[PDB]
Amino acid sequence: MPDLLTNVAENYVNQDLFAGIEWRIDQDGKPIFQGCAGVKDIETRTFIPKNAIYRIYSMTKPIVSFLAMMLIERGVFRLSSPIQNFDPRFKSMKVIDQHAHIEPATALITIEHLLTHQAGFSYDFSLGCPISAHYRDAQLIEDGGRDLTDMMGVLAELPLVFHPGTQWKYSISTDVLAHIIECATGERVDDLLQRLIFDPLDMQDTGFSLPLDGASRLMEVYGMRSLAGLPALKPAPHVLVPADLGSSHPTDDPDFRRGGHGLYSTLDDYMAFANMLLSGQTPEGETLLSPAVLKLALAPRVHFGARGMRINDEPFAGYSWNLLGRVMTDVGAAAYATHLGEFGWSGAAATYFWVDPTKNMTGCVMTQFLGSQHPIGSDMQAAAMSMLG
Amino acid sequence: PDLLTNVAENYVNQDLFAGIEWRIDQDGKPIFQGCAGVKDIETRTFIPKNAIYRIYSMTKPIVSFLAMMLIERGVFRLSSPIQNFDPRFKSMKVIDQHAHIEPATALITIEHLLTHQAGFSYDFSLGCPISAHYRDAQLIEDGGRDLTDMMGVLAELPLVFHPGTQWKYSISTDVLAHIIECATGERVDDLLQRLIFDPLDMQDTGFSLPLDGASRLMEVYGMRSLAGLPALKPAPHVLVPADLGSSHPTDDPDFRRGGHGLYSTLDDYMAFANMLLSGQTPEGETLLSPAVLKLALAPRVHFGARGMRINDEPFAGYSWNLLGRVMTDVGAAAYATHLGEFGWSGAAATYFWVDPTKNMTGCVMTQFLGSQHPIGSDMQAAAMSML
Ligand SMILES: C[C@H](C(=O)O)c1cccc(C(=O)c2ccccc2)c1
Numbered sequence: 001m002p003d004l005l006t007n008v009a010e011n012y013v014n015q016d017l018f019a020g021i022e023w024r025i026d027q028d029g030k031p032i033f034q035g036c037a038g039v040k041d042i043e044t045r046t047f048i049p050k051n052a053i054y055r056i057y058s059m060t061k062p063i064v065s066f067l068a069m070m071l072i073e074r075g076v077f078r079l080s081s082p083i084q085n086f087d088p089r090f091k092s093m094k095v096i097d098q099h100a101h102i103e104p105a106t107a108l109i110t111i112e113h114l115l116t117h118q119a120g121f122s123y124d125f126s127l128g129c130p131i132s133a134h135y136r137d138a139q140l141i142e143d144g145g146r147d148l149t150d151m152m153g154v155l156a157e158l159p160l161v162f163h164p165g166t167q168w169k170y171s172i173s174t175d176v177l178a179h180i181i182e183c184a185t186g187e188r189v190d191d192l193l194q195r196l197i198f199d200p201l202d203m204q205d206t207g208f209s210l211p212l213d214g215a216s217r218l219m220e221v222y223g224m225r226s227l228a229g230l231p232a233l234k235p236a237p238h239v240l241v242p243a244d245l246g247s248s249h250p251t252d253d254p255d256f257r258r259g260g261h262g263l264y265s266t267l268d269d270y271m272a273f274a275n276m277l278l279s280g281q282t283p284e285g286e287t288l289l290s291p292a293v294l295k296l297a298l299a300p301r302v303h304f305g306a307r308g309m310r311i312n313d314e315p316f317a318g319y320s321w322n323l324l325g326r327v328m329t330d331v332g333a334a335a336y337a338t339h340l341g342e343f344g345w346s347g348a349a350a351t352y353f354w355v356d357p358t359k360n361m362t363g364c365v366m367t368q369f370l371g372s373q374h375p376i377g378s379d380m381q382a383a384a385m386s387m388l389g
Numbered sequence: 390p391d392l393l394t395n396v397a398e399n400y401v402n403q404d405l406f407a408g409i410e411w412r413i414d415q416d417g418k419p420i421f422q423g424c425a426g427v428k429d430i431e432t433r434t435f436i437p438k439n440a441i442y443r444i445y446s447m448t449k450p451i452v453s454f455l456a457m458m459l460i461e462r463g464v465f466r467l468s469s470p471i472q473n474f475d476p477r478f479k480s481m482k483v484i485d486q487h488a489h490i491e492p493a494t495a496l497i498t499i500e501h502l503l504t505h506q507a508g509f510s511y512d513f514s515l516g517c518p519i520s521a522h523y524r525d526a527q528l529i530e531d532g533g534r535d536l537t538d539m540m541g542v543l544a545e546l547p548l549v550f551h552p553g554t555q556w557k558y559s560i561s562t563d564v565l566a567h568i569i570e571c572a573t574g575e576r577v578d579d580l581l582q583r584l585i586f587d588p589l590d591m592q593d594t595g596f597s598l599p600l601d602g603a604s605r606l607m608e609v610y611g612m613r614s615l616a617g618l619p620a621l622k623p624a625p626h627v628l629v630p631a632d633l634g635s636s637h638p639t640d641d642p643d644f645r646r647g648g649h650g651l652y653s654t655l656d657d658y659m660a661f662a663n664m665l666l667s668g669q670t671p672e673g674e675t676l677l678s679p680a681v682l683k684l685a686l687a688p689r690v691h692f693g694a695r696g697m698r699i700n701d702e703p704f705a706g707y708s709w710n711l712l713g714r715v716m717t718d719v720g721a722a723a724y725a726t727h728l729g730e731f732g733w734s735g736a737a738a739t740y741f742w743v744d745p746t747k748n749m750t751g752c753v754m755t756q757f758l759g760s761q762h763p764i765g766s767d768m769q770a771a772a773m774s775m776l
């Protein structure tokens with residue numbers, strides 16, 4: 001019953017493992033626990049500003065996935081839609097394996113494959129993956145200044161690493177999804193996110209560029225995990241040194257937009273999104289997604305074998321995959337406190353959130369550390385679970 | 390006793406075959422030979438001198454041998470993708486018995502064609518997922534269509550498995566004949582004439598009848614029909630003349646195929662069979678080197694418990710080499726043979742064998758489509774027993 005959340009965060013700051021941390025836990029749509037620890041940057045020790053801004057990386061994916069579900073509801077496409085219907089550059093895909101064998105794909109990539117990371121795409125930083133070296137040579141993630149549409153043209157020429165539908169591998173497929181959304185609608189994904197999600201939820205600080213007053217609110221990002229170079233064979237030491245993002249994550253590029261990363265947000269903005277996922281509605285009662293399609297989106301859809309869900313061989317114990325991210329399907333296999341049906345996702349800079357329908361609960365932890373050797377997100381979830389009976 | 394004569398005469402006396410010729414050679418010279426019956430039961434004309442037979446799939450070892458000669462001469466190789474010579478065979482699809490279609494994951498090669506592992510089917514393959522589409526396209530029925538044009542129609546149809554992954558007796562020897570034409574810029578009938586028939590003095594073998602051939606052509610009997618669907622049970626074995634429609638013209642100067650269509654004689658086919666003991670003409674001219682003949686005869690496709698089957702009929706103890714069947718287990722065989730015996734047969738019940746352990750060749754010529762009696766194997770067994 002003590003405040004384990006503050007204890008976790010203060011200990012991380014006091015041990016020089018994270019510069020600054022913010023968190024909020026809501027229940028029934030209202031804050032029940034919240035706090036902050038540390039500073040905006042350790043170089044000057046400026047205090048965490050009001051409505052501090054974070055690079056949320058793959059916490060972009062549940063947002064872009066939710067947009068796709070809205071467009072499915074509105075009839076733009078369906079889960080079974082072949083993506084080549086919208087961009088013929090994804091016609092005639094090939095599949096490569098670890099033995100240098102290449103053959104034509106025997107199934108078409110669908111919207112559902114993109115949402116479930118079963119399309120056969122890879123990721124630039126996937127260690128040991130048969131094709132990731134070719135992704136890195138193409139600078140798919142590193143070259144943030146390249147237009148989404150043009151990056152997709154380069155990706156489309158590369159082989160998949162399995163036949164669509166047959167395996168699971170966490171991937172660039174959410175970026176493909178953002179692009180296919182643009183093809184299917186004739187609109188830009190950032191404009192669609194603004195009009196259909198951010199504005200109805202009053203997420204005024206969320207987007208692919210900083211707000212006008214955003215520079216002074218941007219949290220510094222730390223860590224040794226590097227985008228420029230080969231995936232490491234052992235984790236870099238966990239040290240608070242400012243991270244060099246190269247040109248991968250611009251702050252003021254009006255055309256920068258992605259599906260798998262790239263949003264800036266705030267704790268308050270992301271909690272508005274997370275709370276919405278408990279119902280599909282805005283706080284006033286506008287429906288962003290009907291209950292039936294929200295249930296379709298949250299139902300466990302990819303189930304895993306004995307070794308479970310893994311990303312670069314890191315486990316997500318007891319989790320299955322739904323159309324928006326992870327979902328807890330076996331508390332008896334879980335590695336940290338949770339409840340059946342808890343869902344959410346996380347980002348490369350150690351941001352983390354969850355939604356727990358059994359407790360009408362949402363939680364989010366914001367920090368900026370790339371390559372963390374400490375699972376701060378899960379530690380904060382566990383603390384909150386222990387505090388909510 | 391003359392077991393060969395007893396088998397043949399019994400077949401004639403029981404009204405099962407109209408006329409039968411046979412010859413067995415050892416060391417290039419006849420040791421057994423005979424005939425029984427007539428050219429046609431309607432007029433009871435005797436089997437003529439140098440009687441002519443439609444040899445159907447005994448065309449395949451000849452066209453396969455030609456392909457081996459062209460391999461030896463560097464025209465192509467076993468691993469050559471056929472799409473290099475005819476791009477209509479680029480981007481093949483594969484269909485299955487559950488209506489699923491997907492792109493082929495391997496290219497069809499020359500070796501696939503020679504081994505019936507390319508994924509092609511045959512018009513009369515009962516139960517085969519794609520054979521209905523072959524029949525709708527009249528691939529075998531339409532004998533007047535030029536080989537090149539028939540191949541264009543075939544190339545648009547899906548395979549029934551991915552190239553290299555299974556065995557199914559098929560139209561692939563016709564594809565091989567066509568790819569030979571593409572690779573050489575010559576016609577397959579002209580190549581066969583120059584490279585095989587003329588050196589072996591096979592003056593009566595070809596895709597059309599000789600000028601004096603009409604009176605020598607044996608009548609063909611049987612109820613197995615090319616027209617309709619493959620039958621669910623065999624038609625009665627009765628001596629009624631067969632209607633070939635337009636599938637097997639006698640005087641079309643452009644008719645040529647890889648899997649069927651040759652006319653030949655007993656003497657001509659024995660010249661070919663005897664050559665396969667050495668790769669040489671009787672005079673000693675080399676048609677195929679010993680090394681490539683060995684490559685062609687070595688067992689290349691091995692079969693599971695069900696063994697080699699064509700429309701579910703077994704070839705017990707046989708494996709497949711680049712020219713046809715080859716005996717690989719005498720203890721599995723269903724009739725007398727020796728290890729390494731090889732050869733093939735045709736739809737009108739013609740049959741031949743080469744037995745290297747005995748320096749022996751044999752051929753039985755008759756004309757019956759849809760036979761319910763294995764006359765070829767009965768005659769091989771009789772000949773083996775007379776040694
Ligand atoms: C999967 C990972 C995440 O969001 O978890 C992700 C997605 C997209 C981009 C990036 C990066 O920019 C990056 C930065 C430093 C090192 C490696 C990658 C990381």
Ligand SMILES: C[C@H](C(=O)O)c1cccc(C(=O)c2ccccc2)c1
Pocket residue numbers: 445446447513529613614615636648649734735736737758
């Ligand atoms: C497979 C079979 C054979 O040579 O064994 C074959 C190959 C080619 C053509 C034909 C036919 O014309 C035919 C004639 C009557 C009935 C069915 C097919 C038969």
